[PDB]
Design a protein around this ligand. Structure first.
Ligand SMILES: Nc1nc2c(nc(Br)n2[C@@H]2O[C@@H]3COP(=O)(O)O[C@H]3[C@H]2O)c(=O)[nH]1
Ligand SMILES: [Ca+2]
Ligand SMILES: [Ca+2]
Ligand SMILES: [Ca+2]
Ligand SMILES: [Ca+2]
Ligand code: NA
Length: 150
């Protein structure tokens, strides 16, 4: 049922920190425009250095965050993320290429894929959320500098 589907997505999206206080009409816009992409173990959802403008919410499974850093020939493992966490906002906020890899850690990982326009018309319309994400990205920049990210 369309209604049952939309209710399931509404309940999930309201469990995401960043989205919990969105007006109904903006949550409905996300519900209407999100897409789902599925990944197998080891797949790169995001690859450092590539262009990208999608915002992702992890809906099922776990992902690894890895990043190239000075003194290491392979990207180093920074953290892992789980259901309800999000990623890919930094390319939009920093106006940059992707700055880390996001790798599926297991099979049947599912992410919600939110394009730039949808992001801009929902999350990006609320100054409190923009300022929050600006501060979060600033902390990511601090972390990048402290580990000597390439
Ligand atoms: N640069 C950077 N990015 C991090 C970090 N942790 C995460 Br989650 N991320 C996420 O990894 C994504 C890679 O694509 P992005 O640069 O668009 O956004 C990044 C962030 O959402 C981090 O320490 N540094
Ligand atoms: Ca974690
Ligand atoms: Ca604004
Ligand atoms: Ca921190
Ligand atoms: Ca950087
Ligand atoms: Na992808």
């Amino acid at each position: 049922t369309a209604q049952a589907r939309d209710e399931q997505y509404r309940n999930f999206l309201r469990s995401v920190s960043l989205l919990k206080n969105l007006p109904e009409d903006k949550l409905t816009k996300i519900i209407d425009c999100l897409e789902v992409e599925y990944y197998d173990k080891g797949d790169y959802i995001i690859r450092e250095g590539e262009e990208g403008s999608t915002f992702f919410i992890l809906a099922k499974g776990k992902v690894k965050v890895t990043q190239s850093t000075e003194g290491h020939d392979q990207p180093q493992l920074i953290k892992t993320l789980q259901k309800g966490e999000y990623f890919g906002e930094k390319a939009l906020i920093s106006d940059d290429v992707r700055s880390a890899n996001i790798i599926a850690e297991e099979n049947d990982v599912a992410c919600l894929v939110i394009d730039r326009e949808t992001f801009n018309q929902t999350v990006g319309t609320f100054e409190e959320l923009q300022k929050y994400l600006e501060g979060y990205v600033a902390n990511l920049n601090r972390d990048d500098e402290k580990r000597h990210a390439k």
